[PDB]
Amino acid sequence: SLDTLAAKLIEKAKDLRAGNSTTPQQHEALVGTLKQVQDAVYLPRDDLAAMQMGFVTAAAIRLLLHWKVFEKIPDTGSIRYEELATQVGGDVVIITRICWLLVATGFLVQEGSDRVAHTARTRPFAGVNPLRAWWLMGYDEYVPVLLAMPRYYDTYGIKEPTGRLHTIKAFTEGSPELTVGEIMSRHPERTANMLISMSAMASQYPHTGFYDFSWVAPKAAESATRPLIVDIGGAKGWTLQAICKETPEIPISRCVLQDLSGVIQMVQTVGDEDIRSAQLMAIDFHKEQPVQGALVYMIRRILRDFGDDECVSILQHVVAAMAPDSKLLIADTVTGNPPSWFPAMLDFFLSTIGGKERTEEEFRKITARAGLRITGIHYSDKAEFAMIVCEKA
Ligand X SMILES: Nc1ncnc2c1ncn2[C@@H]1O[C@H](CSCC[C@H](N)C(=O)O)[C@@H](O)[C@H]1O
| Residue 3 vs 273, nearer CB to a second copy | 3
Beta carbons within 8 Å of 22's beta carbon, 6+ residues apart: 12, 15, 16, 30
Report the sign of the C-alpha dihedral through residues 162, 163, 169, 171, in that order: negative
**223 sits near a second copy (criterion: CB under 8 A):** no
Q: Which of 255, 302, 370, 383 binds ligand X (CB under 6 A)?
A: 302
Helix (H) / strand (E) element for 379: namely strand 372-379
Tell which one of 61, 211, 259, 352 touches ligand X (CB under 6 A). Answer: 259
Among the residue ranges 88-96, 241-249, 279-287, 380-388, the one whose residues contact a second copy (CB under 8 A): 88-96
How much is the CA Rg of the chain, to the nearest whole Å?
A: 25
306 is in an annotated binding site: no
Q: Which DSSP string corresponds to 315-375? A: HHHHHHH--TT-EEEEEEEEE-SSPPHHHHHHHHHHTTTT--PEEHHHHHHHHHHTTEEEE
# chain residues binding a second copy, by CB under 8 A:
100
Q: Kindly identify the residues of this chain, within the stretch 10-49, that bind ligand X according to CB under 6 A.
A: none
- Least spacing, CB of residue 313 vs ligand X, in Å: 11
The one among 101, 116, 275, 283 contacting ligand X by CB under 6 A: 283
Segment contacting a second copy by CB under 8 A, of 23-31, 259-267, 324-332, 372-380: 23-31
97 binds, options a second copy, ligand X, none, Cβ within 5 to 8 A by partner type? a second copy
**Residue choice 21, 25, 45, 381 for contact with a second copy (CB under 8 A):** 45
Q: How far apart are CA 206 and CA 380, in angstroms?
A: 8
Nearer to ligand X, 52 or 191 (CB): 191
* Single residue of 71, 83, 117, 135 touching a second copy by CB under 8 A: 135
Listed ranges 57-65, 174-182, 261-269, 276-284: which one lies at the site for a second copy (CB under 8 A): 57-65
**How far lies 204's CA from each of 201, 226, 301, in Å?**
6, 32, 12
43 contact choice in a second copy, ligand X, none (CB below 5 to 8 Å, kind-dependent): a second copy
How far are the Cα atoms of 9, 38, 40, 152 from residue 4, in angstroms, in the given order? 9, 13, 13, 45
Q: Within a 13 Å sphere around the CA of 369, how many CA atoms are in the beta-carbon half?
A: 13
